[PDB]
Amino acid sequence: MTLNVGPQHPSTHGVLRLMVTLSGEEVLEVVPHIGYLHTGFEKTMEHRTYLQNITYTPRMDYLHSFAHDLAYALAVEKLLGAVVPPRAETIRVILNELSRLASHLVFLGTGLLDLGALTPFFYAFRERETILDLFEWVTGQRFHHNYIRIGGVKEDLPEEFVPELKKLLEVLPHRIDEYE
Amino acid sequence: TWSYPVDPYWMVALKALLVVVGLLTAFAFMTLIERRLLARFQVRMGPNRVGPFGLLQPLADAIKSIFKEDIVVAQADRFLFVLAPLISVVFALLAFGLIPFGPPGSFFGYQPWVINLDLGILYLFAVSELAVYGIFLSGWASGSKYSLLGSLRSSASLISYELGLGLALLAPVLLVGSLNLNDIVNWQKEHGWLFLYAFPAFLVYLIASMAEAARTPFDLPEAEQELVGGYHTEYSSIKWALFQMAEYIHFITASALIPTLFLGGWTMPVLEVPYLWMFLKIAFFLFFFIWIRATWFRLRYDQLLRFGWGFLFPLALLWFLVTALVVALDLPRTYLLYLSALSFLVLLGAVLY
Amino acid sequence: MSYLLTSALLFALGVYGVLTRRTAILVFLSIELMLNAANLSLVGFARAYGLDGQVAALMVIAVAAAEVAVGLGLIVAIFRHRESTAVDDLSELRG
Amino acid sequence: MTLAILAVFSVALTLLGFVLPPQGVKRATLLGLALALASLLLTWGKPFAFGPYAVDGVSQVFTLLALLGALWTVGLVRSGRFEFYLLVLYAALGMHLLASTRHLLLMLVALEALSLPLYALATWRRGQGLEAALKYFLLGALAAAFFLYGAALFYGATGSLVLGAPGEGPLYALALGLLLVGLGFKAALAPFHFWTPDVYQGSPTPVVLFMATSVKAAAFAALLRVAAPPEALALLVALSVVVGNLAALAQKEAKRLLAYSSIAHAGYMALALYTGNAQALGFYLLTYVLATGLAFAVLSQISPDRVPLEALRGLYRKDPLLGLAFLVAMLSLLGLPPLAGFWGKYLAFAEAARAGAWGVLVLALVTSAVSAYYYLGLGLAVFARPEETPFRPGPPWARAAVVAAGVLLLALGLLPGLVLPALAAGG
Amino acid sequence: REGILFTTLEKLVAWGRSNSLWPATFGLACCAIEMMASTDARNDLARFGSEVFRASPRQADVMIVAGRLSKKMAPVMRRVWEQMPDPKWVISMGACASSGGMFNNYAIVQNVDSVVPVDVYVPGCPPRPEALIYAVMQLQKKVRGQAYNERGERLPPVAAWKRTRG
Amino acid sequence: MAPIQEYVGTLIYVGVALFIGVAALLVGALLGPKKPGRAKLMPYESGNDPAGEVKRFPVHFYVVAMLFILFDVEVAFLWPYAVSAGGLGLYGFLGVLAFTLLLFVGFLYEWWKGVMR
Amino acid sequence: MSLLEGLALFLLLLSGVLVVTLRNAIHAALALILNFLVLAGVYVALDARFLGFIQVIVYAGAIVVLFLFVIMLLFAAQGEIGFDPLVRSRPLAALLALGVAGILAAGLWGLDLAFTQDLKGGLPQALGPLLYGDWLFVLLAVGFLLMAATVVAVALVEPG
Ligand code: SF4
């Protein structure tokens, strides 16, 4: 059965086209077909300022976006010889690990729902919502945040970020232990 | 129907129409309750909107369902495409009248039930086959083999566990000696709550009825996230609504039958109120089942077939043989109480390792 | 008595099916119809002669199920790799 | 208590084959069949009935014949599938049940139980084998439908499903006819013969041995229980023997020709049905089973798929004992003195003449003389010059089996007054 | 019959459809994840009538295009839309869907209204889940006949009721 | 036993249920826009080939169904013993036990061979 | 009786005609299921109730379900492919059907029977002692037949 699991259907997350060559209940071979999300960053970026491109970096991996932001910032800093302040570096690692936790939350929720049960999606997404509240506090944006800069970060943290981050760091160990 | 009177045919027709429209309102508001109970399970809240309690949203939904451009897909069998939903719905609706909701006359003069046929469980088995019938038939008529495959998965799994249902239902017949629901109920009135004697059969009936789309095969399948299920994906306005309606009526019919058959169909040890205890047990099983719906994963229907075929059905026939030995030698009826209690203790102690 | 004549009529109908049908499966279906006509005659004569024809027909049903299982397995094995089931496609064995 | 042995061995080996090699499973099947045969011998003169199940002289003799045919056909088959032995065991038990009852419905159940495993045993997977299996299954299910409606009309004409009930006029005649249709199809009588040539040509030769011996034995055993009218018997015999021998004249292939010859031989055996002596028929079937098993064991040693006529030639030069035994079998199937096939033929004809059917007996004899044409074109071809032909000169198993079969044939032809005295109660 | 030709009946059926609006998401990019956030246990589009979510297109009236629509995805989305029951509406979520957004290039459709008849537009990158709820109430009151543009005109209940499909 | 009146009431039940179902179908069919289009009538999934061209489905479903017919025959035979049990005594118990064990040996063979195939 | 009895017999005959006439395998099978339903109703009317229920459960519920599974695995709905029409065979088949009906009609004609026995409903309560008892041996033979059928089909498919 050369079956065509189409793009977005049935409930194949991350729109993709699959030609599952398959007889029975096994999986002989899946022929993948991609390109349905090709936007052309590698070309569009050639026509944007280096500062402008910081708006283009989060939008490709939109779950762990600050990793894109950090990779691009670091490459430009190496190329033009920039010096990153230590506090800016600490903030950058915090944001990267926070977006990492958000992405890990979304990945595991999507997997469990994809096969398994629906319920455990909501707890992971509640913790993700706390993380997104942190991101709004600091950058004014949920994701695609334009905060990193070639020198460093756009501006400094408000007073309220550290208390809410400690709150989440205290609740998270029990939460992750619950998922486990 | 040894001891029970018969209402006039017009009164039987009236009671039948009442039970059908009551199952309509029942499945609609039970969809509301399942939405909101799932919402409570996952810390969110339900539809405090179009209600107040959301109880006008099924009305809005039905009003959408009609006028929704009921489409007859080309390249699909013109007649069978239309015909299959009616089958799946009718044979899910019927076989609920048998359930006694009270002692005779407790319907304000006439009859708690509609029909009290002498052979009940056979009627249940037969009408249970016809649900799988409608499922795979609509799968075919859809004219999409993608849906057909899910229909076949469905049919395979449901047929397996539907066979298991028979060996499950064997055991209490040996004790009661009648195939009438009221006689079984009165036997549970005298000796008490047949599940106390037949706990293994109770368990296997529960897990078999779970395969009847209740949940945790969950490779029933639904079209979502797998090789799509059967009987849907090609119906738009009214026929899809009818498919889901019948699946839910079968769900609640099983949730009602479980206490009716194994537990104390209404006939409580105390206070003997006709309807309320039966409805409460229905609600109890419904809430436990929704807990399952929320809280447990799929089975891939391969593990589900393996499990049902290798474990449930052999276990059910073994318990049937034990009960048959006991009844043939008739030694006490206390031995079955002891045996079911010990079997429950065994199947429990193996969990807490 | 009308039931026994109706059973004979159903027997004749299944015979016509067996003769007319091009497909092995539909031939087998016509045969099942013949079997059930026989079962109805048995039930009528059981109503006549005291209920033994009922157990007879029950055993008949069981036998029919077994033979259906076997024959459908054979049909699948013969026409799984092979094309259209039409029984005229097999003429190798001749007098 | 032989049926008990059969059922025990079948059910046990069903699961035993999981831990036992197919060779061990074949050894086990052989031991069980021989033990059932020994029990049949030790119970000679001990008729035993429990339910509708009844062991009498007929049951004993015909199940002895079937057990012999099954043993021979199993000896040759060396396939590494223990199911190919499970099916033979099932068929043996089914034929025993068929021969040991008068209940029509239990007879139907036994018929299905013995016939279904043969349909599967007819699959060497050769393309003709599937065609043969298909024709066989379809015509067999049709005849099962007919036999079932005959049993229903029997239950209509009388309160019981057991044969021997008094019986009405036209309706009883109709019920008897609807039973006779299925019984003759299973006995390869014309004009129900069409399946036999195709099935014998398509099925593997050892399976055809098993069939042409045990199936015909059990079929005639069950036929003896029916009170077949003389006019119907006359028609069956005439058509069967005439068409059998005539169409066998035209056959270019050994298996198909032997099938038509078996049609003619069923026509012959149907004469003893006039009186239902069953001693004459028991003897006839003893002789015919031995001869046919011999011939088909030789044909199996030649080729399992198909054996043409010329392949038989040079068989003497290849193996003299095999050529001679094949000649003896052809003569015993021709029914010529001083052979036990002739004695069975004579006993059937004596029963027929005692029944007073003269023209039918004459036509049977004329068609039997016609049969000598191809019976000699087979027996004498053994001496011709060997042409290109595959020949595997068997094991000592099949050699000794063929030789003992021919020896028993000739010995009971010379002194039938040894065994024939005990085909009745068995003194 | 489309919900028309009686003063009471049409308002009643529009009420029904407006509250029973059945979303079918067509997730393309990060707009799709910000729409998945409109269902979590802080702000759920599971009250107004959008609790259930049938992945099939034969079963939903509202088609929510959430993300950048690549030109290779345009025919697929086109046919997913055409394969919907007829009383159907289209929401265009985010800048990439509404206009070409910041990706103004050969790869992305510069207005989804090119391929599907769009009912509601909702700007933002991503548009906030509460902005999406504002859009669905907008569409609600649109199919209620309570929607007007900046020019004063009342808007028809269903777009894709005005096109010569073919 | 039970009177035929309950069976006539059963017939009434079926007639009522079927009448209500046909009423629902009439409402659903009559109330609709009725704008057939080619792409709308197209089966599924963006142009062609939701299932597309696939050869015959796995015989696993056949195996499950045949298994089911045989074991359902089994249950059909087990029911008369289930009702008439105490009167048939140890002898009836032994006969039904023999029947059950035969068909369970068949099941054990088909299981140790398995059908994942 | 005759009012609804004639109705039920006409339904049976028409369903048989459909199952033997229609060239759609699915449609024929559905006609045969309708036939089995009408036939179980007639069974109940003939005081055979358990037998009607098993006719629905096994024959309709299981047997023709497997049939439908087979014909849906192997499409085969448009049977008229590879015709070898032999058009002369259609009137001959109709003739043979009429004759096999007429001979039975002759055998049953002028035949009146005592249909007066108190079956007490063909309930399993009263059928049990016959099944396990006089028919216990036939039952055991049937069970052995079923086991043999399982092994037969299993070894029959068994690709290797
Ligand atoms: S508008 Fe922004 S959030 Fe939406 S798909 Fe485009 S990049 Fe993603």
Side-chain angles (χ1 to χ4, degrees):
Chain A
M1 305 174 182
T2 297
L3 172 72
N4 185 22
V5 180
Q8 191 66 56
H9 301 83
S11 296
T12 176
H13 72 233
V15 46
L16 161 61
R17 181 203 190 200
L18 291 193
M19 299 299 290
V20 194
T21 300
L22 167 67
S23 295
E25 219 44 52
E26 284 192 323
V27 168
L28 277 299
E29 63 170 29
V30 179
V31 175
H33 292 116
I34 59 173
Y36 292 113
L37 264 195
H38 173 62
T39 295
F41 301 82
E42 291 189 6
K43 179 75 133 186
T44 309
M45 278 175 154
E46 302 178 20
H47 298 99
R48 252 65 162 172
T49 307
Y50 292 87
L51 169 53
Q52 268 184 341
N53 287 323
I54 307 175
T55 57
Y56 281 64
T57 47
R59 268 94 181 175
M60 296 135 95
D61 183 335
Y62 32 83
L63 282 168
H64 201 210
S65 80
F66 206 84
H68 270 283
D69 288 37
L70 185 60
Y72 173 82
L74 288 172
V76 182
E77 301 167 342
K78 298 251 304 161
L79 184 60
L80 53 75
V83 293
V84 193
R87 170 167 200 192
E89 185 201 62
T90 310
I91 296 180
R92 271 144 82 125
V93 316
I94 295 176
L95 296 177
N96 193 15
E97 304 304 273
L98 203 52
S99 175
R100 187 187 301 277
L101 297 166
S103 157
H104 273 357
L105 283 176
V106 159
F107 145 79
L108 67 86
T110 48
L112 272 65
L113 175 60
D114 270 4
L115 193 140
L118 51 151
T119 324
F121 167 55
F122 284 61
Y123 314 84
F125 211 105
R126 178 209 132 197
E127 277 66 92
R128 189 201 162 77
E129 275 297 311
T130 319
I131 290 185
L132 289 192
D133 291 324
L134 290 169
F135 282 146
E136 197 176 328
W137 267 112
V138 48
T139 77
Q141 287 180 294
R142 308 263 286 181
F143 38 87
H144 305 321
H145 30 266
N146 178 15
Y147 191 68
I148 203 166
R149 291 289 177 260
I150 309 296
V153 290
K154 189 186 176 140
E155 50 194 19
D156 217 330
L157 307 172
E159 317 95 64
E160 299 93 318
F161 175 79
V162 198
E164 308 304 314
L165 184 49
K166 292 190 152 277
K167 208 177 191 67
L168 170 135
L169 260 43
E170 178 175 17
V171 60
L172 263 197
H174 154 244
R175 283 311 315 171
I176 297 139
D177 283 38
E178 250 192 50
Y179 308 114
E180 171 160 52
Chain B
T1 325
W2 209 276
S3 319
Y4 318 99
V6 174
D7 299 354
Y9 293 159
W10 69 266
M11 186 47 182
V12 156
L14 193 146
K15 284 188 311 168
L17 187 145
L18 293 186
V19 172
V20 180
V21 305
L23 262 56
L24 274 173
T25 55
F27 97 92
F29 287 62
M30 285 297 177
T31 52
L32 269 169
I33 301 151
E34 186 171 1
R35 292 184 183 177
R36 276 239 206 178
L37 180 55
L38 290 185
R40 293 290 188 270
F41 262 125
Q42 41 204 30
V43 80
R44 177 204 56 189
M45 291 180 73
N48 284 277
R49 213 57 46 177
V50 192
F53 203 23
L55 56 82
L56 297 180
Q57 184 92 50
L59 198 76
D61 295 350
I63 294 190
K64 159 190 174 83
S65 301
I66 60 175
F67 304 86
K68 192 45 179 164
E69 168 82 358
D70 165 50
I71 182 181
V72 168
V73 192
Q75 271 46 45
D77 193 83
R78 304 283 289 179
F79 185 53
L80 287 183
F81 189 85
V82 185
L83 173 59
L86 185 78
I87 303 167
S88 183
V89 168
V90 165
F91 295 102
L93 288 169
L94 53 83
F96 193 88
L98 268 70
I99 308 176
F101 290 157
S106 83
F107 185 50
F108 292 161
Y110 297 146
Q111 273 322 313
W113 63 79
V114 184
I115 46 173
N116 197 214
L117 310 173
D118 46 65
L119 302 174
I121 59 182
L122 273 65
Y123 179 67
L124 308 171
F125 203 111
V127 310
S128 303
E129 300 232 56
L130 312 182
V132 189
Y133 253 115
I135 292 192
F136 83 89
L137 275 184
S138 178
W140 173 267
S142 76
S144 158
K145 295 179 258 296
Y146 210 126
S147 285
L148 241 183
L149 184 131
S151 92
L152 295 192
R153 313 162 85 76
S154 78
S155 188
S157 69
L158 266 71
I159 281 173
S160 284
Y161 290 78
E162 203 276 338
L163 157 71
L165 280 182
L167 297 175
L169 282 189
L170 276 182
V173 169
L174 291 160
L175 296 174
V176 181
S178 161
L179 291 212
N180 187 294
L181 266 60
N182 275 101
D183 296 323
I184 310 178
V185 160
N186 305 331
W187 198 100
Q188 285 150 237
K189 178 53 181 159
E190 291 187 24
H191 309 64
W193 282 29
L194 251 180
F195 95 106
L196 296 166
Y197 304 78
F199 183 80
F202 172 71
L203 268 192
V204 302
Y205 185 88
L206 171 66
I207 311 291
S209 300
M210 103 176 183
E212 270 70 349
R215 254 196 210 166
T216 326
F218 206 57
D219 299 80
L220 193 285
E222 241 179 323
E224 302 169 355
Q225 320 265 10
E226 192 200 354
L227 259 282
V228 300
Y231 70 61
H232 47 46
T233 318
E234 302 284 316
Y235 299 96
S236 91
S237 169
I238 194 89
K239 297 187 256 58
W240 172 89
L242 290 207
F243 277 115
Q244 251 47 57
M245 170 173 145
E247 183 168 355
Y248 253 101
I249 281 144
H250 216 292
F251 182 24
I252 70 173
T253 290
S255 305
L257 280 182
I258 301 168
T260 295
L261 304 172
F262 290 84
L263 316 178
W266 79 109
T267 315
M268 222 69 185
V270 194
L271 304 177
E272 187 57 324
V273 86
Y275 285 66
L276 279 67
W277 285 104
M278 177 66 77
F279 286 110
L280 260 53
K281 301 173 163 187
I282 290 165
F284 173 86
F285 271 99
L286 254 172
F287 291 4
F288 171 57
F289 275 136
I290 296 186
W291 200 352
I292 304 320
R293 310 262 275 183
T295 326
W296 278 339
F297 289 9
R298 285 214 200 121
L299 258 62
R300 88 181 178 187
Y301 99 94
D302 300 332
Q303 156 62 215
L304 170 89
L305 284 209
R306 173 269 170 205
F307 164 88
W309 212 258
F311 167 90
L312 281 184
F313 316 154
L315 188 90
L317 72 86
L318 184 147
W319 183 252
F320 150 75
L321 289 184
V322 170
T323 54
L325 183 55
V326 171
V327 176
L329 278 308
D330 212 292
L331 314 85
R333 297 293 183 267
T334 293
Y335 278 12
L336 293 186
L337 287 179
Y338 177 77
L339 272 176
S340 274
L342 187 65
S343 73
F344 157 81
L345 297 179
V346 170
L347 291 175
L348 180 74
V351 159
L352 272 83
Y353 252 70
Chain C
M1 173 55 57
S2 314
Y3 310 100
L4 300 323
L5 307 148
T6 312
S7 80
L9 278 171
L10 291 183
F11 190 86
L13 284 180
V15 164
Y16 174 83
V18 171
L19 304 188
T20 300
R21 292 309 193 189
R22 207 187 318 279
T23 37
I25 330 178
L26 276 68
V27 170
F28 201 5
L29 211 69
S30 302
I31 289 199
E32 293 302 310
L33 181 94
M34 299 163 67
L35 267 57
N36 279 275
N39 266 350
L40 173 83
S41 190
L42 261 183
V43 170
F45 294 136
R47 180 189 40 155
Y49 293 109
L51 191 141
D52 286 278
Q54 270 201 55
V55 173
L58 215 174
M59 306 294 174
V60 165
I61 287 172
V63 171
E67 89 164 346
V68 156
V70 171
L72 290 184
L74 189 67
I75 283 184
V76 171
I78 301 189
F79 315 87
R80 158 158 52 164
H81 40 96
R82 187 175 235 287
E83 59 186 344
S84 172
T85 76
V87 83
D88 307 321
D89 278 335
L90 302 89
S91 54
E92 282 185 19
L93 292 165
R94 316 178 163 268
Chain D
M1 314 221 75
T2 288
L3 181 79
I5 309 185
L6 290 189
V8 164
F9 256 76
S10 290
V11 179
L13 276 170
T14 301
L15 321 163
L16 270 159
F18 288 106
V19 201
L20 267 57
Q23 292 72 26
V25 183
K26 198 180 76 183
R27 305 159 200 159
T29 56
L30 286 162
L31 167 66
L33 293 174
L35 283 182
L37 190 142
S39 81
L40 266 178
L41 297 151
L42 303 183
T43 56
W44 218 250
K46 196 216 167 191
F48 168 94
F50 219 155
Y53 170 80
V55 181
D56 60 277
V58 172
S59 182
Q60 273 156 12
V61 173
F62 289 77
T63 54
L64 172 60
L65 306 186
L67 286 179
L68 220 65
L71 280 164
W72 204 336
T73 194
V74 166
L76 320 168
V77 178
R78 67 171 64 195
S79 183
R81 303 175 58 177
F82 62 110
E83 308 89 334
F84 268 62
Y85 313 133
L86 263 53
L87 303 186
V88 172
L89 278 189
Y90 295 161
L93 180 143
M95 297 171 314
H96 172 81
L97 277 177
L98 170 68
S100 290
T101 66
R102 286 198 196 261
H103 196 313
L104 291 181
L105 192 129
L106 184 47
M107 210 178 309
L108 163 73
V109 181
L111 283 170
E112 288 277 328
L114 77 97
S115 53
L116 293 178
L118 292 170
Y119 300 156
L121 283 171
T123 45
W124 205 31
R125 272 122 82 86
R126 215 294 214 174
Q128 46 180 32
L130 288 179
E131 185 176 315
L134 180 62
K135 290 181 179 299
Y136 197 13
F137 158 74
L138 281 193
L139 296 166
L142 178 99
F146 274 96
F147 172 85
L148 177 59
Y149 200 81
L153 289 197
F154 185 88
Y155 191 73
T158 185
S160 280
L161 293 151
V162 186
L163 290 178
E168 202 201 296
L171 186 63
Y172 183 64
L174 188 63
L176 278 189
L178 290 179
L179 298 175
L180 281 179
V181 165
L183 291 146
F185 157 83
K186 220 65 181 66
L189 281 175
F192 309 146
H193 68 280
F194 307 102
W195 65 276
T196 310
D198 291 41
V199 172
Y200 283 31
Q201 196 172 54
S203 305
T205 301
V207 167
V208 192
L209 179 153
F210 182 45
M211 305 165 72
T213 62
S214 301
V215 175
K216 197 179 286 287
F220 272 109
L223 271 167
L224 289 164
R225 309 294 173 73
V226 189
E231 318 84 357
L233 229 49
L235 176 56
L236 302 170
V237 166
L239 259 49
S240 299
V241 191
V242 171
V243 177
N245 300 290
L246 289 196
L249 285 179
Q251 294 315 311
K252 39 144 74 182
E253 197 271 316
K255 300 207 291 171
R256 199 171 187 91
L257 179 137
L258 285 199
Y260 287 104
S261 158
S262 288
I263 305 172
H265 264 278
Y268 302 140
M269 293 166 180
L271 273 67
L273 271 289
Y274 268 110
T275 70
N277 189 214
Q279 189 179 355
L281 206 54
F283 195 90
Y284 195 167
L285 267 72
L286 184 272
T287 77
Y288 178 88
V289 157
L290 279 172
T292 288
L294 188 153
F296 273 86
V298 179
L299 286 192
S300 296
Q301 298 191 27
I302 297 182
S303 154
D305 181 29
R306 193 178 284 184
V307 173
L309 296 171
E310 300 77 6
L312 285 171
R313 93 195 323 153
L315 171 62
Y316 177 76
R317 302 172 176 78
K318 298 164 188 182
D319 197 327
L321 288 182
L322 271 54
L324 295 184
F326 184 80
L327 189 154
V328 163
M330 287 309 103
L331 301 192
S332 169
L333 296 185
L334 184 44
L336 217 70
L339 284 154
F342 161 77
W343 283 121
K345 282 213 183 182
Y346 157 72
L347 278 180
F349 301 147
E351 301 301 316
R354 224 177 74 190
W358 300 111
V360 169
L361 178 70
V362 171
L363 186 59
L365 296 165
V366 175
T367 49
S368 182
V370 169
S371 73
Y373 181 94
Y374 53 82
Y375 277 126
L376 262 56
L378 275 50
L380 281 181
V382 165
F383 299 113
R385 210 215 317 118
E387 294 179 352
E388 68 284 4
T389 284
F391 187 67
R392 193 144 287 106
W397 199 296
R399 173 174 272 191
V402 171
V403 161
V407 167
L408 223 54
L409 276 166
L410 56 88
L412 302 182
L414 292 162
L415 305 172
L418 261 55
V419 285
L420 187 53
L423 290 204
Chain E
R1 43 195 66 261
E2 309 150 82
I4 200 188
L5 294 177
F6 201 105
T7 166
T8 302
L9 206 165
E10 60 172 296
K11 302 308 160 40
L12 163 73
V13 64
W15 142 254
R17 305 213 225 233
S18 59
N19 304 275
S20 174
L21 290 171
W22 229 267
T25 184
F26 201 82
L28 305 160
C30 34
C31 268
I33 300 188
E34 198 77 313
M35 176 175 171
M36 280 160 53
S38 49
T39 76
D40 85 85
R42 150 160 189 195
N43 263 338
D44 51 344
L45 188 43
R47 297 179 218 123
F48 303 92
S50 305
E51 165 67 20
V52 194
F53 215 131
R54 312 269 80 199
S56 313
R58 303 297 201 177
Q59 307 170 346
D61 55 305
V62 165
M63 184 176 185
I64 297 165
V65 182
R68 21 192 165 108
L69 196 276
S70 171
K71 282 187 203 178
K72 184 181 193 180
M73 185 57 142
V76 161
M77 193 193 54
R78 186 35 187 191
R79 292 186 201 87
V80 176
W81 174 90
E82 287 168 315
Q83 264 146 59
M84 223 173 285
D86 224 315
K88 67 200 160 188
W89 296 271
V90 170
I91 292 174
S92 173
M93 178 172 174
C96 296
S98 307
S99 57
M102 101 182 96
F103 312 116
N104 197 324
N105 45 258
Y106 63 94
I108 306 281
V109 185
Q110 294 279 324
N111 187 355
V112 176
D113 192 83
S114 287
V115 277
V116 305
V118 175
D119 281 276
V120 174
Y121 294 85
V122 46
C125 176
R128 188 157 190 84
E130 299 85 73
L132 177 66
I133 275 63
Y134 193 76
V136 308
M137 298 190 78
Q138 215 74 200
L139 185 71
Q140 235 186 352
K141 94 217 200 82
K142 185 202 184 208
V143 317
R144 307 180 211 243
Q146 208 189 294
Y148 308 82
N149 54 28
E150 286 284 311
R151 324 192 62 190
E153 314 180 47
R154 175 191 309 278
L155 296 163
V158 190
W161 238 241
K162 335 162 301 163
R163 256 192 212 182
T164 323
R165 307 197 167 180
Chain F
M1 214 190 62
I4 191 72
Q5 319 293 323
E6 284 220 279
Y7 295 27
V8 192
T10 300
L11 203 172
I12 290 190
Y13 195 173
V14 175
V16 173
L18 210 159
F19 174 91
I20 296 194
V22 178
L25 288 194
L26 293 194
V27 185
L30 292 176
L31 309 178
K34 317 178 172 321
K35 289 200 230 176
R38 196 215 81 231
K40 201 178 303 132
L41 302 162
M42 290 181 70
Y44 191 53
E45 199 59 22
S46 324
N48 84 107
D49 220 295
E53 161 218 2
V54 302
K55 94 161 170 50
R56 315 297 82 215
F57 299 160
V59 184
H60 158 230
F61 307 128
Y62 157 90
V63 166
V64 167
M66 172 215 94
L67 268 52
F68 172 73
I69 79 187
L70 301 164
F71 287 59
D72 194 290
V73 159
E74 167 170 338
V75 182
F77 279 107
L78 297 180
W79 274 318
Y81 172 75
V83 278
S84 51
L88 274 56
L90 193 149
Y91 307 91
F93 159 79
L94 231 53
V96 79
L97 166 73
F99 182 77
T100 301
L101 292 179
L102 259 63
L103 269 67
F104 181 79
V105 164
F107 164 81
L108 201 72
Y109 165 87
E110 77 145 311
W111 190 254
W112 286 352
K113 251 145 168 199
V115 184
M116 311 172 188
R117 174 176 54 205
Chain G
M1 295 170 296
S2 298
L3 318 176
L4 192 145
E5 169 172 331
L7 166 149
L9 302 192
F10 156 74
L11 259 52
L12 255 169
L13 284 171
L14 175 69
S15 181
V17 166
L18 260 61
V19 76
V20 305
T21 301
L22 306 186
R23 184 54 62 183
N24 191 315
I26 297 282
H27 287 47
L30 204 145
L32 173 128
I33 305 187
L34 160 71
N35 206 74
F36 287 174
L37 264 52
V38 173
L39 184 74
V42 173
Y43 284 175
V44 172
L46 283 192
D47 257 331
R49 308 178 165 173
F50 173 79
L51 193 74
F53 276 13
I54 299 307
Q55 170 74 38
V56 179
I57 292 187
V58 170
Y59 254 120
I63 298 191
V64 49
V65 171
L66 172 55
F67 260 107
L68 287 169
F69 265 16
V70 168
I71 66 192
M72 292 171 25
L73 298 171
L74 189 51
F75 153 73
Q78 325 308 336
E80 53 150 73
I81 290 196
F83 301 82
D84 256 28
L86 277 47
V87 174
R88 185 88 72 188
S89 179
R90 262 186 67 165
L92 196 51
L95 165 70
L96 296 158
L98 293 176
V100 77
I103 180 64
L104 302 185
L108 290 133
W109 195 232
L111 191 276
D112 302 84
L113 242 184
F115 289 123
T116 71
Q117 276 208 237
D118 275 52
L119 289 126
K120 308 185 269 144
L123 304 205
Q125 219 65 238
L127 259 60
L130 294 211
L131 212 163
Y132 303 83
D134 194 16
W135 291 83
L136 185 45
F137 195 87
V138 166
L139 168 69
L140 265 54
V142 160
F144 185 92
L145 163 69
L146 296 181
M147 183 197 63
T150 65
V151 159
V152 161
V154 159
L156 205 55
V157 179
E158 214 206 325

